Each structure stands twice: as C-alpha cells, then as structure tokens.
Subunit: 114 residues, 4 copies
C-alpha cells in the first residue's frame, strides 16, 4: 500500500520534524502539492533533529514525505493518529538497509499550530 502520503485541511499551517538513526546520511524531502517545500540532510545514530519547519498545506492539502540515502529511496511505513478529536499526528518511518528497525529517518508531522 502507498505510504508517506497525507491529506491535510487546505491552507493550514503544520510542523514537520525529521530525526536520523543510521550510519548513512539521510535526505528527507517534504512535498506540498507535488512540489518540494522543505529539505533536510544529515547523519546521526543518536536521534538528532536534522530539521524542523513550519509549512502551509496550500490549496490541495496534499503532503508527501520521501526519504533517500545517497540517491537510493528508503522503504517507508506510515499512519495518522488523532487524539481527543482535535490533535493530529502524521508518522513516518524509513528503512535504508536490511535490519528492519525502520528508524533510519523518522518524520513527524503535527497540526494544528498556534
């Protein structure tokens, strides 16, 4: 099934935050309406915040997360969870190798803000 794709409410601010847990350099691209809106890069085996930004969902509300290591796309897992019918979390995990811990690049999207 398709992973790493979420439909947010239109014209709404959201936060996007990436973590790294691998010996390979992670490249995280965040797409809004099929165009790159944010990009983060870095290497960590200690859960370093390789980037965090505030973006607008735009007219479409389509947000996609892609992860690659030196050009090679990582396998993705994702889900969305809503607490008390108000607070939203869009969660992404990625695997760049064989051990299947899926933490090599972890991406968290949260809304609403303010």
């Amino acid at each position: 099934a398709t992973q790493g794709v979420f439909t947010l409410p239109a014209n709404t601010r959201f936060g996007v935050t990436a973590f790294a847990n691998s010996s390979g350099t992670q490249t995280v691209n965040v797409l809004v309406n099929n165009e790159t809106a944010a990009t983060f890069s870095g290497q960590s085996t200690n859960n370093a915040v390789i980037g965090t930004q505030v973006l607008n969902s735009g007219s479409s509300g389509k947000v996609q997360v892609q992860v690659s290591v030196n050009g090679r796309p990582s396998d993705l897992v994702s889900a969305q969870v809503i607490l008390t019918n108000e607070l939203n979390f869009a969660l992404v995990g990625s695997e760049d190798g064989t051990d299947n811990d899926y933490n090599d690049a972890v991406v968290v999207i949260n809304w609403p803000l303010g």
Copy 2:
C-alpha cells in the same frame, strides 16, 4: 484515565522532543522510574522546539510526561503507536487554556534509536 504514562522495554534508549503552541511559557518534565530525568521550557506560537534529548528507560521502563503552564498542570492526552511491529511512538498533547486545541505543548517519544 491516566495519560502521559508509558511502559517501555527495560534499559532502552529513547528520544524525547517538545514543541510549543501557546501565549504562555510551557514547562515539560520527563520522569523515569518516578524521578525527573529531563526538563524543557520555552514559549512559541509557531511550533518551535523547546527541547530535545536522549534518555535511558532504566530497569523499570516506566516513563511519564508532565506539563505545567502559568503555575498549573495542563490536561494531557496520549497514545502509543507501533508501525511494522518495530517502530514505536509515544505521543502527548496538552491544554493550558479554554480553547481545547491540545497543542499548547506537544511531546513526541520515539524508540528504538541507533
């Protein structure tokens, strides 16, 4: 029901990150085995990261998040999500006022690391 309390696997390192979305200054305390292990503080209405840290779950694995604003504990909402039977997220939202957006302090715990 009790919220913001999580049982992690014993002696496992986890990441903890806090965001702020309120007029008031947020104080986030992270407890391990019923003792304070980390404390974050700051103010933002733009989802700024007020703290991030790597901790150990210890012998018991019991981890608790508490949030205080303007001298009063915030109301908490929480849940744990596990993707592909490997990647764990422990999510916390909090409310300090009357609008019930529950984003005033957002806390994300993730494991395993490395």
Copy 3:
C-alpha cells in the same frame, strides 16, 4: 479531555461493534448527531461480541459512544487511527471498576464500508 466523540465523514455508513470483558453487565450507547442510534448489552469475561451494527453518520457526521454498568457511566479512553490515508478506525475502551484494564466494554468503529 473529552473522549468517545468522533467527527466522521458526513452522510457516510460505518460499522460499530462492541466486546465485553467484565463480571458486570455492560450497556453501550451510540449517538449520531446527539440522538441515540444504537444500544448493545451483555455480560462476558471472554470478549463476546455483544452487538454489531451498520449506521449512517448523518448530515453533521458527529458520533458519540457512551458506556454504563448498572446505571453508572464508565470512564472512557479513545483515539482515531488512519491507515494508508484512507482506512479509519475509531477506538473506545471503558473502565467500570478499579483494576484499570479498560477492556470492560471495548467499542470499535470502522469506515468506509462496501
């Protein structure tokens, strides 16, 4: 925080199903736009499916779950999970006593159907 309340897609069919794990007789009420649409009841300590039904969410889409044992309201926990940006589960747990297993009446709401 308010629990057991969910905003479903308007005018859409959903499935609601209840399980029982208590020595006390459970009563589950399902409200659609603030009016009782379904009621299930039973007594089992072995996860008996005391009721399953298909309902329409109506013009507003507001769905609420309430649980009571001998006329006393049970404490509720709830969350919504979305898989592959399409498949939805609204989950409810309830506690009628003091052991805090929160499984005394478990309610699962799923959509879309068909």
Copy 4:
C-alpha cells in the same frame, strides 16, 4: 514493509474478529508461532462479522494474519495502538482489487481479556 505481524505478551489470551466488505469471499488465517490457530471465511458488502474467536499467544507471542481471496494473497496494511498504557489494538486492512479501499477484509485483534 511487512504487515499483519504482531508480537503479543507470552501466554496471553486475545480476541480476533474479522469483517468483510467485498464481492469476493474472504479467507482469513490466524497463525500463532507460525502454525494455523484459526480460519474464517465469508462474503459481505455490509461489514458482516465473518468470524470471532479467543486464542492464546503461546510461548513466542508471535501472531500473524493472512488474507486471501480465491487463493490470491491480499495486500495488507496494519498498525498497533495502545490506550492508557493498558488496552491494545492490533488492526489489519486488506485489498483484493484495484480500488484501494483496503476494507475487503478488516481484522481487529484485542488484548487483554477478562
């Protein structure tokens, strides 16, 4: 990523329930420690319960759900959610066709019981 595989606590009773939303007959296999423990089969486009049972997780705690339609394995989506650090849901969606509604056979695993 692998889907439909869950690690439960050892020697623990759990409930497994399957729903159907497809013109094709759904066959659901539940494996405990890599051996078939339960099999459900049925057809519905109205979310009918095609089977429910209580099983023991055994010494390993490994539980796997498989879905097939007329011999053809369905693509699976899954996640585990824990409420108030006590109540566990293991959730499975499956797709047998081209529309990608992933509800053709829906499987809900819940624990603890009693």
